[PDB]
Design a protein around this ligand. Structure first.
Ligand SMILES: [K+]
Ligand SMILES: [K+]
Ligand SMILES: [K+]
Ligand SMILES: [K+]
Lengths: 91, 91
């Protein structure tokens, strides 16, 4: 079953790196989206919690807040929903 | 800025049709997702609020709860986040 989110958003802030019991690094962060959709065009603005695990945690850990990111990933239950980023690029 | 969600999920329930002041029909509903992702494979399960506007409201309004839907759309602020379905198919 497909569960794929593509989102170009601004990194607002990120938490300090933490780890799962297995030692997998995780960086929780907040993304901000601003743009338009098609439903009559509609301006859309919202923020969404996200996180990077493993290599993605390392990647997010070096990105300066305010950077615009082109993200791809999947949605999941926090433990509320959180955006799991599996792919990332600038601009 | 891209904001696109692709989700194959089961329609759990839907509210009665309502309208915006302009007369645009809207059907709010709840979707349930079950499947796997790639982060090491990870089982993922969650429910998410959604809605269809205009023709999409009419389409959802005739779909029986329990039906599996292949959805495409965008995320937005409820007024919390809600999945705006702009495209829909069965299976
Ligand atoms: K999947
Ligand atoms: K911070
Ligand atoms: K867009
Ligand atoms: K109902």
């Amino acid at each position: 079953a497909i569960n794929r989110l593509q989102l170009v958003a601004t990194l607002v802030e990120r938490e300090v790196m933490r780890y799962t019991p297995a030692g997998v690094p995780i960086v929780n962060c907040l993304l901000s989206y601003s743009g338009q959709a098609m439903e009559a065009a509609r301006q859309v603005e919202f923020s969404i919690e996200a996180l990077g695990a493993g290599k993605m945690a390392s990647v997010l850990d070096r990105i300066a807040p305010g950077t615009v990111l082109e993200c791809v990933g999947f949605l999941a239950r926090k433990h509320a929903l959180v955006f799991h980023i599996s792919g990332l690029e600038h601009h």
